[PDB]
Amino acid sequence: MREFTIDFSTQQSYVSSLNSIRTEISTPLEHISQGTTSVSVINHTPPGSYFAVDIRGLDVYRFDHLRLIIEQNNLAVAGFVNTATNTFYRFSDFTHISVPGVTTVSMTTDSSYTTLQRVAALERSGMQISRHSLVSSYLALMEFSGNTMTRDASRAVLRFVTVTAEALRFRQIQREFRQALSETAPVYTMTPGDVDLTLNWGRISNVLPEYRGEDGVRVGRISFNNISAILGTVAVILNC
């Protein structure tokens, strides 16, 4: 199994964490590249493949027991591991993710945003994420037990999926969120445009391998005027 750390200590450690993951699980597209920046395609792995992400650096000046299990082919969060209790809490739509050496709790709750936002009573559009709320999300997940997601657990998942898996996919989200890691701890507010990106990752993944030369591409309401717009927005796409 692959294992990565996402270190939230500083803006620098967070960005370099995301770039190391991208380099290991994906390959740059030839035609969407500028300097060392590219759109990359996830490398093919056998179905059911997953890797672990260890969360660190939530407190710059501890909190080191949270691990996320990520299905590799679609960068989906299949669940979270409490490493203190060695327990894997797995969403109901990921029963094909088999992790040896952990106690697996199959949950009644699925991973969709519709479900998570209902239980959390929280809309992603306008959702705030700060350093203190990631520490708070960590503690909710370490406190969690049983097989049914709670409000606090679902808020925590919404926040961690945004700054890990969705930031991995979308350079736009990485760039907008990393400010929250600085020494004054400003707040990242997710925008309607951020949410629209996450809802269109599949379609974006389908069109970019056909992009040639320069100039624009449109996927529904998503419009990229040039390759810089693409690179500023998208980092990693599905392999279809």
Binding site: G35, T37, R171, S228, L231
Partner: peptide, 6 residues
């Protein structure tokens, strides 16, 4: 070393 879009 980061990129200019990060």
């Amino acid at each position: 070393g980061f990129g200019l879009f990060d």
